[PDB]
Point group: D2
Chain length 217, copies 4
């Protein structure tokens, strides 16, 4: 280890939403063993974005999840080789996103490369209309499957006018090398936008995340 | 009052699974303010179900959910008129179930009436082949919507030969009288089969369930 | 054979939509080898339905599907015993319906028994608001699976304020005796409400439906 | 006009399937008013794809769809500017794919640019195990929505070991310029792999496709 108490990271995203091409670059840092991390983003191409920043927020670091000792830390165990992760986001209004990412380690710094494709968002929807205002804190249900780690979440974006915009997440974590997998468990998360410029071409986020067993066990 | 510290209930279910008709009846009791309840069932018609009992178990009492004082207990508030509940269960292998239920209070006893329709289960699947062995403890994400209370869960049935069989629950709770809805919150639950005969024509269940805010709030 | 060129039928339905119970009875007739049939329904209980009649229309006769000689007529072959049918209807706005049906032959006439459960329809949506106006003609994709016949359709209801309300149908047909199944094929249908009273408590429908191979074959 | 009776095209795709990156480039040609076209592809990077080629085939030209004079040919009318198209493919076993593409016209040659992300495919499934054998002919259901053209299809891949592997397609066609949209209609298609080398690093395809009204209209 390899994975120190303090770790920095670099991230780059190439994405497309309803046909709108964009690129984003950023840097972050956090305490992998404490379950917290922050990140600053900059839209390098296609800005300002014609859609809610919120749909991108969660694609910018699960190696920072705090895990109790009795729960194998698959993501952490994968380094230095690292792991890849994939995801599907099913929006209640038909919107669909598919994400592919690669997580590596270079000279003590984490390297994240992301590809994102979002389609079918209604022109007058909350995404396309920028009517959201952050995510609610969430709880992911994880389990080992097909030799890899999987998890699902029932998430929600807060609507300006009140109410919520529902999104189901389905993620897949795949170590680049064989690593001990955990059993059924949960991960609580809370992602906040801490700052941003008026057109959201510059953004700062904070995330707290921790794994645990269900409370009744 | 109407809802005492100790309350009993009676339940009747009329269902069909893959064309197989059946009837179930039972009696239960519990501590509504403590978050626990038990129930004893008996298959009265269509006896010897040709499918896993597990898919029926969660259809047999949310008025028993322990809620903190700062979270409006919508279901409890609904009495004496009571409430209705509906649900969709999406099985990973294509099976689908819709449930509609009516909850009332009669002579100091909770009265539950359930209709269930399950279709599209593979004949060789874990349901039709009775390969399941109980649910993992779960956590439901609730929120108010359309004037009613809704909630979703990523649940899972343990496989006898190892692994899990996934199911997504979508529930709707509808008070028969206008009462206070809570905001976004969660419900942890754990249902166990405490006793049964080999063919599951006689079963007893126990369930613990409590409402709460997300752990990071 | 038992299936004459002219055949009548009797249907009875017990359903629930968003907690509202209802019952319907009807009588119909048609020419099974020609691909057309009519039916007259009367709401016998729960009358003055508080939702779009159109969601019920398609649950009231596949044995009447015209099949070319080179495509095994599974449903017809199942008689005199008959067959069962189940279905899932997934509505674009979240509403979900499950149906289970039993088709038999008695007194020289077909006997239909249907059970319907509909949930999660938004209070302000086209179904509960009664804003639909008939289905567009459709095309079902069928194939043999798990020893039975299955088919799916991408359906659509026309709306009063223009546009369409999309629904995906997934049906399963199950013979009560082993009969020959066909391979991959298509069924074309067009259902029309031919008459109805002011409150839709008495309704008359017409349906044309025919099986065939893809046109490029 | 801009669109002549015979037209060639250039296509290129960047994709990722279950974390495996690849690139493909190719050229095709056909008769846009006749609904016939062919294409030849070469895997340029990510050599020897570790998954079924079949999943990519339908991503390689709807301007070639034959339309009757009474049905607006939205895609054709969008030129010379062109149009973009997006798509979601939902695999029966959990795999999900999103696609985004751009179609333009350059000096008499159509230019196609495709981005593809596929995730959640079971390692032991027909895709990653290459057990598929081409698509069945299909029929897409189209309708105008949100100022654009949408269509859905219930498709199927033939399994080597027999049977079919089901896939639901959801496509969105967006003209770069708001040209005339058609109303509800269908498109029949039949895609065949005409030639291919052992490892699917060189492949040629043929597609027949024509738009039309429902047969009962």
């Amino acid at each position: 280890n390899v994975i120190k108490e303090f770790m920095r990271f670099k991230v780059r995203m190439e994405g497309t939403v309803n046909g709108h091409e964009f690129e984003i670059e950023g840097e972050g840092e956090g305490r992998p063993y404490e379950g917290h991390n922050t990140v600053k983003l900059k839209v390098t191409k296609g800005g300002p974005l014609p859609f809610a920043w919120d749909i991108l927020s969660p694609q910018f670091s699960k190696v920072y999840v705090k895990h109790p000792a009795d729960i194998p830390d698959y993501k952490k165990l994968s380094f230095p080789e690292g792991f890849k992760w994939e995801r599907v986001m099913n929006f209640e209004d038909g919107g669909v996103v598919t994400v592919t990412q690669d997580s590596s380690l270079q000279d003590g710094c984490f390297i994240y490369k992301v590809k994102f494709i979002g389609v079918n968002f209604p022109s007058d929807g909350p995404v396309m209309q920028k009517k959201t205002m952050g995510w609610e804190a969430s709880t992911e249900r994880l389990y080992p499957r097909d030799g890899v780690l999987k998890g699902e979440i029932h998430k929600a974006l807060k609507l300006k006018d009140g109410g919520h915009y529902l999104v189901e997440f389905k993620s897949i974590y795949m170590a680049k090398k064989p690593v001990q997998l955990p059993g059924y468990y949960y991960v609580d998360s809370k992602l906040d936008i801490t700052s941003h410029n008026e057109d959201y071409t510059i953004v700062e986020q904070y995330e707290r995340t921790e794994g645990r067993h269900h409370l009744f066990l």
